[PDB]
């Protein structure tokens, strides 16, 4: 429209349907130059890394994205509350996403001082990746996101993004991408940006935990009609043979005959947050789970979907195999614990092995008169018909969805971090100031200009998300694990501000109160 | 609209139609970024409080919101003593408010010298709490109201809020409350705002002082049908005793029944402008009377309606019992009584108990033949079916309405500071500058941006009240008491500008002139 | 329950216009009197101006469930509240709504003023506190005065240059107008209606 006229409203509510919610979130953002407008190769190379297991190769962008695929974007605290104590389960539906009143500002410094003008006539550059051809690299837990406290003012981060490497070296096969390829809409102030996006058909992520065990599910009163071999020996001596059969019942759980399995496994180490019943020895890496591919090793770091630690047992944690979320103003390298905040999974120990377990026990050898009964530790255990679980639970300070890689074969594409996998998943918002030079030599000259105004953008994103919700219909008497805050007197309010200003969020939060019969 | 257009026009006038007074009011205002942006934990701890009754906890806010809520933003003193000699009552009926010409401003300081100039670009964002979900400060009487003289420019009030608290802490029912989620509009220049409201029906103000009092009500030429006990005792010496019964009459006016008595009474301390006769020692807070709210100690600060002094002892006054408005100049600290004014309610001296007096006497014991009958002072009298009572009178310096705090029960929620007592009142209308990052880094950083563009924003606000009159019908042969200028000669006319430019407000101006029966 | 408190309801940040008494000496010795006038303001809370005034008090003995801290001596029913009618002393069994416990003072509870339930298989008669499940009223400490406390203080004379100024304890206080108060909270073992009496008058008929 014009200079004078706002092109957008503030919108930050959340509305409760029935069946719906609705979250909108506004926020303002500023938008640097990247890479003096260039694109650049990058390497391991680039950056002076060494291990292979570490080597990449790829290209940075002058281009920036949005990042709203965290919950805490879309979910006040007390929304998460709402959300979580009372639904079974939630999907998201639909995505509204705007960009408006932009502004364009020029920098002028003269001698160590600068002046901030604004720049009328100066465009961004907006568009969306709708066809995922780009890499993307929003299913990626990033920083970046849009800020939880919808007072914040956040940068926009730069894309880059890696295509196929040896070494630091680059193969025929590896692609490179221009985003100047695309069409984009110009935007000057005045100018405003929208799109909407359908989710495909994701299930319900489960916001319940179980509450029966799967080994648990029988008649407590009742025997089984099946019979299991109880004893193989007549008793002491030699040439004490037999087989003695009994009926599976109330008394001896272990030996009945059940229909489903727990779900599969691949073992973690068990580390102590109580420090000295750790080893005394450097385990991190060393003693991690990993995967291989093409000769580099990558750390299992999430899971497949498995209970963090027995009952009990809360000071252990799988080596890589939960999240761990810092705290606000945790540094970035080498902090202690207490500054860290290590999510655990212990709700799906009804249906999951514990990460930190073998899965079972399977026959080693045929027994014979000369040879006595082997068994060995199944410490990967891949999928079985019959096998039933749980996937990851969700954060409020976690990913969303991902993008499911695009495949011939997947199983259960449900994204390991956690959150709802899709093959068409929120595409991926571009945006860059758009280059100005400066003046230009009198004569020409072929080369590309170099030298261009100093320059940077700010304005509003609004993001608004449908979510569809699963309502309780449970039968249980007793009242319910909720979440709650803590009445004790504290200095601060917890998810509020701070007397400096900062805003934190104490704790992790899962979905994971209600329950269900299993 | 766009840069060069006026967005609303001045409009300032008052129109009298025949039952009806349409204010309006239009003046200049200046908005500052309030808190760096940024919403901070504040408690008596971060200001150096000590005293329990003085704790508190809660939030400033980069928000800043408008007052109107002083009777003299609404009524020239010309038109308020146009109201109050000719009407017995008044009530607000329509609100109209607006918000034009906003003007946005950039400020950049070079060395010891700062430079102002236009930032079209930028916008300000305004909503209204329409639905009373923020914690309401209109009701409390704050500074910040629009000026009463209309060329007077007014900075707009940071707001703040306070929640539970325990000492300096909180506990976890306190609530913090972010004003970005909620949605508001975003106004560049050219851009305008404005919204209505409606009055819920409250009653007429009463402006008019009774020309009865409750105990003469009684026809003085007629005796009463009823008796009373005149003589409990024959004479003197032993064994006199008696029941005599005399009719009430007009000689003894104090013993005749009556349907109605006086209101409720809190008894405060008697302070005499006649500082001699006051005693020597410090009592303003020891002797003061005060109610007690979780451990705290809150000074009853207006009494439950009381008339101020007796007949002819305008130089006492109660301790609290009263509102004190300063003078134009009037320091915060420890000004003399000739620095401030203080408010009598004089007028109620006829249905009201004298705040300074005790309610009366009651019966302490049963009398016989070996007591004597014992009486004792009322110091406090809650409400007796049968008592009648008039509110506390209002004033052009005083607060129009307050809110009615959101309660299972409450009893006559006028506010005790007067004016009309509303469940939904006026709304809340929140201002704020929207930040504008200064030039962020060219390498992404996660860390909420903490530089802005120095910036302010000035514009106009319109606010039309339209009010319901309540007309004399008295048959009173005789003139009566009007407020009036005094025609001898003085070197400043009251109500007016100085001779540097000061608009004053030389006495406070009650609305009780005109008189009815009672 | 009320995420603020009656007498918390201003802006923090702003002073108030209105002014009160500060300071009636001009210090030590002899003939000092004055009277200055402050802004109430962020700095003094208490002595702010107010619109509403907390609810009725009828004042209840304290008991502490911590029992060293009780006097030695039987005061259950001799230092009970009571009402009288037509000679009759009854017990005031539930207070009019008030406020339990101050902040942190959990272990005490009025006499009566709060409702007893039983545990599953408590007994009739003189059980201990463990097998009984006491009430409170805490949440309604925003607009309610404390139970066990007293509304507040009242001037009992007229000070002057002979006369100090006086003030006395209020134990009991009706309805005023600009008073503001909350009903007792209704329990899952709790009653829910009552029959209002059928009477000329009456007042917030809440059972
Ligand atoms: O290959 C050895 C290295 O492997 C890395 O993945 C690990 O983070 C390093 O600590 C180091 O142990
Ligand atoms: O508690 C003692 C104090 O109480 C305050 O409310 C009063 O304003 C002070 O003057 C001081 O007397
Ligand atoms: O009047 C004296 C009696 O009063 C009763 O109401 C009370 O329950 C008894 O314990 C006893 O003290």
């Not at 604004?118 to 051809?133: A, E, G, K, P, R």
């Not at 026990?361 to 999928?383: E, L, R």
């Not at 990851?392 to 956690?418: C, E």
């Amino acid at each position: 429209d014009g200079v004078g006229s706002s092109s957008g409203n503030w919108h930050c509510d959340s509305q409760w349907l029935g069946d719906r919610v609705i979250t909108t979130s506004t926020r303002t953002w500023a938008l640097p130059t990247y890479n003096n407008h260039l694109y650049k190769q990058i390497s391991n190379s680039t950056s002076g890394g060494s291990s292979n297991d570490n080597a990449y190769f790829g290209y940075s962008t002058p281009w920036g994205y949005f990042d709203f695929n965290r919950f805490h974007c879309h979910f006040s605290p007390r929304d998460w509350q709402r959300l979580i104590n009372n639904n079974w389960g939630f999907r998201p539906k639909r995505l509204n996403f705007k960009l408006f009143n932009i502004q364009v500002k020029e920098v002028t410094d003269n001698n160590g001082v600068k002046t901030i003008a604004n720049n009328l006539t100066s465009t961004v550059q907006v568009f969306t990746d709708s066809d995922y051809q780009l890499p993307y690299v929003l299913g990626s837990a990033h920083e970046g996101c849009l800020p939880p406290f919808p007072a914040d003012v956040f940068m926009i981060p730069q894309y880059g993004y890696l295509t196929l490497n040896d070494g630091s070296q680059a193969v025929g096969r590896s692609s490179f991408y221009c985003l100047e390829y695309f069409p984009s809409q110009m935007l000057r102030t005045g100018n405003n940006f929208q799109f909407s996006y359908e989710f495909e058909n994701v299930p319900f992520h489960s916001s319940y935990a179980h509450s029966q065990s799967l080994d648990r599910l029988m008649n407590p009163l009742i025997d089984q009609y099946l019979y299991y071999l109880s004893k193989t020996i007549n008793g002491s001596g030699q040439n004490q043979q037999t087989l003695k059969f009994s009926v599976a019942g109330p008394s001896n759980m272990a030996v009945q005959g059940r229909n489903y399995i727990p779900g599969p496994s691949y073992r973690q180490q068990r580390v102590s947050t109580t420090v000295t019943q750790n080893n005394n020895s450097e385990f991190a890496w060393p003693g991690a789970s990993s995967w291989a591919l093409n000769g580099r090793n990558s750390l299992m770091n999430p899971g497949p979907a498995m209970a963090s630690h027995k009952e009990g047992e809360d000071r252990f944690f799988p080596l890589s195999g939960s999240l761990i979320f810092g705290k606000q103003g945790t540094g970035r390298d080498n902090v202690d614990a207490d500054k860290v905040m290590i999510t655990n999974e212990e709700e799906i120990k009804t249906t999951n092995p514990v990460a930190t377990e073998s899965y079972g026990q399977v026959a080693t050898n045929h027994q014979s008169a000369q040879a006595q009964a082997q068994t060995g530790w199944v410490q990967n255990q891949g999928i079985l018909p019959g096998m039933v679980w749980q996937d990851r639970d969700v954060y409020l300070q976690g990913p969303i969805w991902a993008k499911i890689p695009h495949t011939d074969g997947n199983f259960h594409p449900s994204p390991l971090m956690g959150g709802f996998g899709m093959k068409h998943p929120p595409p991926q918002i571009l945006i860059k100031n758009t280059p100005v030079p400066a003046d230009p030599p009198t004569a020409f000259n072929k080369d590309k200009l170099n030298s261009f105004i100093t320059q940077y953008s700010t304005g509003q994103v609004s993001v608004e998300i449908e979510w569809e919700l699963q309502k309780e219909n449970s039968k249980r008497w007793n009242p319910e694990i909720q979440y709650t805050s803590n009445y004790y007197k504290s200095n601060n309010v917890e998810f509020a501000v701070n007397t400096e200003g900062v805003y934190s969020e104490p704790r992790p939060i899962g979905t994971r109160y209600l329950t269900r019969n299993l």
